[PDB]
RNA sequence: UUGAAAAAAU
RNA sequence: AUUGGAGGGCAAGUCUGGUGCCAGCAGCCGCGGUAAUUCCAGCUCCAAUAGUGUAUAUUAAAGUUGCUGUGAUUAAAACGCUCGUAGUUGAAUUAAUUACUUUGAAUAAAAUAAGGUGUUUAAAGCAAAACAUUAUGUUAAUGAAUAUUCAAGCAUGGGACAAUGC
RNA sequence: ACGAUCAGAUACCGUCGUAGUCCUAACUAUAAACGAUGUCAACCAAGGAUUGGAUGAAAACCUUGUUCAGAACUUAAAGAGAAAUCUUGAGUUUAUGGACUUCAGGGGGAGUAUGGUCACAAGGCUGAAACUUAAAGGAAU
């Protein structure tokens, strides 16, 4: 049907997410992220539902895969925080999606006269709190956005939010690693029954 | 009130005395019909506005209303003999779509032109005002005669 | 024809989309086969501009995605209407 | 809210979903009218007017409801 | 105090629809409010509703589907003669093809198009686009 | 609230939290 | 010529035919040359030529602000504003903004569906600042009953019958036209009864030809 | 700590 | 064929002589202190037309008197605050009057809207004529049903929304 | 009342000082008496904190969850407005009607004149007109 049986998260993927404490979030909880939160931890911190993390993860990858399966350059992956610069750069390498590495110059989606003016159809941001500028420019160009939101961030101008830890070095690299692998699986360029050659340590900062 | 014989106004002046967009449009017709002054344009405009008000009021009622059937046909009947409204248009909606050229094109000065008696529309006035023209059995010298459909083929010297 | 066009209808609020609305989006979710590879067929979701700027687009879509079957248990039972 | 002060208390008894004198108590007016010794108490001389205006409303209603006799009238 | 229960309910429904809510709740439910919704339901402006009994003039839950623009009550219900209809339609309704008035006549709570058909007048309750 | 929930069928836990008169059908907290 | 936008590229090679194909999907018009391609023969109107001033140490720095209204009489119109040091440049600058600010105008009938469309479909109100303009549908014969300032704009939009009621400081013309354009601008956002139907499945032009413009 | 005032129209 | 006007409001002169903040023009902004587009003139042309300005008053404009329909933090404008009679407004619920609503009855004309009618058309009038090519007949010709008309009053169909006590 | 400063100082500056400042009794009834925001009722985004109860856990005071009432605060890409700004409304308003009360109609003349009334008095309350003039004013650059 719509979520076939080949799409359960294999035990390898769950094993690494708990290892990289992806489920571990912040303390202040946004109201819009209460559904993904399963329970509060021992020192009053949010613990994301791992299944809810994966189901949104694949759904985001499916949307990217469809758009990027004919026009790879029409996807832009912005990543403000210095931690997520390497992982955002490898995501560009293995899918062809453009990826703004460091600071996002305001008006790079609205000013056509600019030399570095790109007009995408999908935007992926590493952190809505750091990359609020990129999200706000979407509301001028009718472009849907996807964010690796955390339990405290504001879900303004984000359509698909992946509940995961976007501050730790391991989780930042791991989630981008899963998104790239899932995208390739949907593309058909990577069999679902094999193991991806590139290890997570490549994405790590 | 003091007098017993009724009186009425045939025209109204425009609300805005000075418009350039109106001086050209009104002078377009004066040349096209050789009218004496701007009173004729207002009179024709006043005449049309009365019929448009009957249809406008009557379109707000039901089709089975007794007044709609009776008064509605009466207005269409009256227009049909005058010939302002084409016969094939027999609904009250088409009354609202009438213009100010329909009424002015049935005037005697217009009719004698297109029938060919008068070379120029300024020349038609002298022939009309001189009683040279005749309508059926009666001599006419008022250039404003709104001829009917029956009297259309009965215009001779 | 009388209409200039037939305006889109937002999938979230079931309300029209303005021609000047520059915050509205259009999310396409391609269908996947039994192997797990996308297909050229897709379903289109439209979200109005004002919905996005509130923090509601993400939760509202999950109601629609779960109803259409692209998600299984993201949204709880008592939150589906 | 309250009849005289701007307070808004919503505390209420809650009868379940299963079906299986006050005027006298407001004569409080006697107790304050204490006023004979504390002549300068401009507060209790105001809260008495509020109490007495309440009595003139319960009497005005118990007469219409034909509960109190038609000759009733509260006085010192 | 709550002078008009109908006014409170309609203003609650209008506010919810502006926010795009999926359903609304009306605390005091009367027969007049229930009958006012049937006029809106017969025109498919609202999906349905559920009168939940609480032994205290129980609440109502109303399902809305992205169609209602504004439903408003009219303060004291003016006696509307049948000749005074199009005067009221030309004021309260956006166009001759869209709006709908509501009148409480002796033949129940009808709209304008079926009170005219039934050939009756009455006090005017409100309207809804 | 902004995250809309079902009103006709409140959750078992939610009606325990709310005020006794603010439940869907007001019931006391006594016995 | 030589556009710098994805949509602008599609228009030049004749892939997007109708202007309303842009309006359905909310694609912003970022080049005025696009409008001149899909909307030939746009009639021209200049509303006012007002001069603003800025006090400086040396004196006053005067600039001329020009309002121009553009649009063909088939339900499309736009209003643009530009201030510059020269009158010729001000009208040319406002020309571009007017074309970029094109907006479809929804018009219907008064009481009977006898072609063709003449008047607004419902009651619309546009809110500039203190000036508020309200448009009421009118029968066939009635012209544009409005002040000289919005009547010039309403002629361009192709609305022949309308009833207008104005509130506010109408003697300031900048807000008067903006409030008129704001009334028409939202004519397509009012979901009437006849627009309930969802409609068929369509495809954005920027998605249909996404692969084509990639090279 | 002391520092008041600057005709009318352009 | 005149009246008023030619800076803007508002259609019409980057025409020539004097005056030099004077005479003056000017409904409002304003023009005139020596190069006046406004003064007093000459020519030119703009509007209306047997009409055209002025002064006063009524209506619209005026959503600047608000029922439809206003405003009250700062522009004018929430009583210093509480109690309170008259007045106005009052939760859900029921399978004798009044009010409300629908039909009539009755109801001076003129006037209003209006039906017909070629006073040469029109205002008008309720006259007349298609026609018998006319005494004859159409003809015992038309007369608007002319609709109304608010506040009361009479009767009747209905009882949802309201009012008055048992 | 003196002494300074000053052109002058009857003022600010310094020193002395009557009524007054305090209490009791009787008056007076006005304030930039202000939130310049009438009273009552319904709906209404996100968040932290606080005063007083109730209710679970945590061994009266503190820490945490729910809920009721009160004085407040922060964010808005939304709603309103002329804007400043408001959001426990100044929102739900040309898409105009929840109930009720008071007040305003260009600026002066003017809270003035006269009439009435209250007070021992100062004064308060109710309160015009003739005439004069194209502005007076609000928020922001």
UniProtKB/Swiss-Prot annotation, chain B:
Q: Which domain of life is it from?
A: Eukaryota
Which GO BP terms apply?
ribosomal small subunit biogenesis; translation
The S4 RNA-binding domain is annotated at: 106-157
Task: List the GO cellular component terms.
Answer: cytosolic small ribosomal subunit
Record's keyword terms, sorted = Ribonucleoprotein, Ribosomal protein, RNA-binding, rRNA-binding
Keyword hit for Repressor: no
Q: In its keyword annotation, does this UniProt entry include Secreted?
A: no
Which molecular-function annotations from GO does this UniProt entry contain? rRNA binding; structural constituent of ribosome
Give the protein family: Belongs to the universal ribosomal protein uS4 family.
What is the protein name for this chain? Answer: Small ribosomal subunit protein uS4
Which organism does this sequence originate in?
A: Entamoeba histolytica (strain ATCC 30459 / HM-1:IMSS / ABRM)
Section covered of the full-length record: 2 to 158 of 185
Swiss-Prot record, chain F:
**Location in or out of the cell:** Cytoplasm
Give TM segment ranges.
none
Would you say which domain of life the source belongs to?
Eukaryota
Family, similarity comment = Belongs to the eukaryotic ribosomal protein eS27 family.
Quaternary form? Component of the small ribosomal subunit.
What this chain does, per the record? Component of the small ribosomal subunit. The ribosome is a large ribonucleoprotein complex responsible for the synthesis of proteins in the cell. Required for proper rRNA processing and maturation of 18S rRNAs.
> Can you say what this protein is called?
Small ribosomal subunit protein eS27
Which species is this record about?
Answer: Entamoeba histolytica (strain ATCC 30459 / HM-1:IMSS / ABRM)
Q: What is the lineage of its organism?
A: Eukaryota, Amoebozoa, Evosea, Archamoebae, Mastigamoebida
This chain is encoded by the gene named: RPS27
């Amino acid at each position: 049907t719509n979520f076939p049986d080949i799409l359960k998260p294999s035990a390898e993927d769950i094993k690494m997410m708990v290892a990289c404490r992806v489920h571990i979030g912040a303390t202040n909880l946004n109201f819009a992220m209460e559904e993904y939160v399963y329970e509060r931890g021992n020192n009053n911190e949010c613990i994301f539902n791992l299944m809810k993390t994966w189901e949104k993860l694949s759904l985001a990858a499916r949307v990217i895969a469809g758009i990027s399966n004919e026009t790879p350059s029409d996807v832009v992956a912005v990543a403000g925080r210095e931690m997520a610069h390497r992982a955002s750069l490898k995501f560009m390498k293995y899918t062809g999606c453009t990826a703004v590495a460091g600071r996002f110059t305001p008006g790079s989606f609205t000013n056509q006269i600019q030399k570095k003016f790109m007009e995408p159809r999908l935007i992926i941001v590493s952190d809505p709190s750091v990359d609020h500028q990129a999200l706000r420019e979407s509301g001028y160009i009718n472009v849907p956005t996807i964010a690796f939101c955390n339990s405290d961030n504001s879900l303004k101008n984000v359509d698909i939010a992946i509940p995961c830890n976007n501050r730790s070095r391991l989780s930042i690299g791991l989630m981008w690693w899963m998104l790239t692998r899932e995208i390739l699986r949907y593309q058909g360029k990577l069999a679902r029954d094999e193991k991806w050659d590139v290890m997570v340590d490549l994405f790590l900062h | 009130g003091r007098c017993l014989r009724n009186h009425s106004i045939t025209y109204k002046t425009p609300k805005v005395p000075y418009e350039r967009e109106r001086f050209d449009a009104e002078l377009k017709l004066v040349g096209q019909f050789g009218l004496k002054n701007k009173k004729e344009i207002q009179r024709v405009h006043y005449m049309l506005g009365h019929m448009r008000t009957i249809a406008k009021v009557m379109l707000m009622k039901d089709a089975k209303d007794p007044k709609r059937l009776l008064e509605g046909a009466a207005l269409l009947r009256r227009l049909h003999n005058l010939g302002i409204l084409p016969r094939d248009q027999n609904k009250l909606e088409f009354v609202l779509a009438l213009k100010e050229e329909n009424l002015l094109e049935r005037r005697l000065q217009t009719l004698v032109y297109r029938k060919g008696f008068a070379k120029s529309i300024h020349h038609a006035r002298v022939l009309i005002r001189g009683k040279m023209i005749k309508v059926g059995k009666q001599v006419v010298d008022v250039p404003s005669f709104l001829v009917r459909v029956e009297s259309e083929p009965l215009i001779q010297l | 024809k009388i209409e200039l066009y037939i305006p889109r209808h937002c999938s979230v609020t079931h309300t029209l989309i303005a021609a000047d609305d520059h915050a509205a989006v259009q999310i396409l979710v391609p269908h996947v086969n039994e192997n797990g590879v996308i297909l050229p067929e897709s379903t289109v979701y439209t979200v109005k501009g004002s919905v996005r700027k509130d923090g509601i687009s993400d939760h509202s879509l999950n109601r629609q995605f779960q109803k259409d079957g692209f998600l299984k248990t993201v949204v709880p039972k008592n939150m589906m209407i | 809210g309250r009849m005289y002060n701007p307070g808004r208390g919503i505390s209420r008894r809650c009868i379940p979903y299963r079906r299986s004198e006050d005027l006298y108590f407001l004569m409080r007016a006697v107790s304050v009218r204490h006023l004979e010794k504390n002549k300068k108490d401009k507060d209790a001389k105001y809260h008495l007017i509020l109490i007495e205006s309440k009595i003139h409303r319960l009497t005005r209603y118990y007469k219409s409801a034909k509960v109190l006799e038609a000759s009733f009238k509260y006085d010192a | 105090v709550r002078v008009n229960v109908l006014a409170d309910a309609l203003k609650s429904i209008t506010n919810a629809e502006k926010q795009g809510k999926r359903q609304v709740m009306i605390r005091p439910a009367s027969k007049v409010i229930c009958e006012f919704l049937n006029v809106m339901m017969k025109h498919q402006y609202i999906t349905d509703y559920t009168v939940v009994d609480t032994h205290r003039s129980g609440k109502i839950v109303v399902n809305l589907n992205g169609r209602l623009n504004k439903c408003a009550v009219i303060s004291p219900r003016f006696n509307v003669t049948l000749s005074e209809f199009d005067k009221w339609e030309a004021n309260l309704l956006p166009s001759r093809h869209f709006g709908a008035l509501v009148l409480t006549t002796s033949y129940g709570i009808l709209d304008n198009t079926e009170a005219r058909a039934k050939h009756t007048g009455g006090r005017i309750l409100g309207f809804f686009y | 609230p902004l995250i809309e929930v079902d009103l006709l069928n409140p959750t078992a836990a939610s009606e325990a939290k709310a005020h006794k008169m603010k439940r869907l059908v007001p019931t006391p907290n006594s016995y | 010529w030589t556009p710098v936008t994805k949509l602008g590229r599609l228009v030049k090679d004749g892939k997007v035919k109708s202007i309303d194909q842009i309006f359905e999907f909310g694609i912003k018009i970022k080049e005025y040359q696009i409008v001149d391609h899909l909307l030939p023969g746009l009639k021209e109107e200049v509303m006012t030529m007002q001069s603003v001033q800025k006090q400086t140490s040396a004196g006053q720095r005067t600039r001329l602000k020009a309002y121009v209204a553009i649009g063909d009489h088939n339900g499309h119109a736009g209003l643009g504003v530009k201030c510059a040091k020269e009158v010729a440049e001000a009208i040319k600058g406002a020309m571009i903004q007017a074309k970029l600010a094109m907006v479809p105008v929804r018009r219907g009938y008064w009481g009977a569906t006898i072609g063709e469309v003449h008047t607004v479909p419902c009651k619309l109100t546009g809110a500039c600042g203190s000036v508020r303009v309200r448009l009421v549908p009118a029968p066939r014969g009635t012209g544009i009953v409005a002040a000289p300032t919005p009547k010039k704009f309403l002629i361009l939009a192709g609305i022949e019958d309308v009833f207008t009621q104005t509130t506010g400081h109408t003697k300031t013309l900048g807000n008067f036209v903006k409030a008129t354009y704001d009334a028409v601008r939202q004519s397509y956002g009012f979901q009437t009864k006849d627009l309930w139907k969802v409609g068929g499945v369509k495809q954005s032009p920027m998605d249909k030809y996404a692969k084509i413009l990639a090279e």
